[PDB]
């Protein structure tokens, strides 16, 4: 059929100045996230610094949904480049350079052990028992 020997050739275009920036994004293979549930999102800079040189902090669906934190890529694009071919109705690819590579990681929302009480329980170096009871008291 036509699909067996399909022939495709589209023109590539590179704009010089673009008012909106691009960045590569990639979740971990084991995250197993869904995008339909992401009804609301809040992508704001972290408050731990106290601006452009700080990480972001993704907060999905307020406190109901999961939160994520990540860092910029250590490597620099001195020799490498990343281009994205955006689909358009006219069919001409529009290669777009990127500015940064980002990698957020999953975080679990639950009662977390605090540093001070961690020090308090550190006396039980290996004498600790009933791992549930560690969190039950807190």
């Amino acid at each position: 059929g036509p699909s067996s020997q399909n022939v495709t050739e589209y023109v590539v275009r590179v704009p010089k100045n673009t008012t909106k920036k691009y960045n590569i994004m990639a979740f971990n293979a084991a995250d197993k996230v869904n995008f339909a549930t992401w009804n609301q999102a809040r992508l704001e800079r972290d408050l731990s610094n106290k601006p452009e040189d700080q990480p972001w902090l993704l907060r999905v669906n307020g406190k109901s949904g999961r939160k994520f934190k990540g860092i910029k890529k250590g490597g620099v694009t001195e020799n490498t480049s990343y281009y994205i071919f955006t689909q358009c109705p006219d069919g001409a690819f529009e290669a777009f350079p990127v500015h940064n590579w980002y990698n957020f990681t999953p975080l679990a929302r639950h009662r977390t052990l605090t540093a001070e009480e961690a020090e308090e329980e550190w006396e039980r170096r290996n004498k600790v028992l009933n791992h549930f009871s560690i969190m039950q008291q807190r």
């Binding site: 084991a30 197993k32 999953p106 679990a108 639950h110 791992h131």
Partner: protein, 114 residues
């Protein structure tokens, strides 16, 4: 035997048992996720020599210039009449000076002992 993690917080699963049903449950000791085991194994230990080096040698070892070559032990699968033989040098045995043969043909590398 067999290690896998829960899908919620991606931490190490741990064995557990329940009194109501008396069934093994690999539950996450961190979060509140539970699942039914399918192997009934917890801790398998191997004291004697069960290393199975035959499946541990990397097949690309044949193309090392420093290893000997022989023509008296042809490959079983592809039938090539050249092979590279070497010993183990792994701890936990410190014995068994036996030869492991690897075929030197490209797109091959069947490992066999003799």
């Amino acid at each position: 035997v067999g290690i896998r993690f829960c899908q919620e917080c991606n931490n190490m699963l741990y064995p557990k048992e329940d009194k109501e049903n008396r069934i093994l449950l690999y539950a996450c000791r961190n979060c509140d996720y539970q699942q039914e085991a399918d192997n009934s194994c917890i801790y398998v230990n191997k004291i004697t020599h069960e290393v199975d080096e035959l499946t541990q040698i990397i097949a690309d070892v044949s193309q090392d210039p420093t290893l000997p070559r022989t023509e008296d032990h042809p490959c079983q699968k592809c039938g090539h009449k050249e092979a590279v033989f070497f010993q183990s040098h792994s701890a936990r045995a410190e014995d068994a000076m036996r030869l492991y043969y690897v075929c030197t043909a490209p797109h091959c590398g069947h490992r066999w002992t003799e």
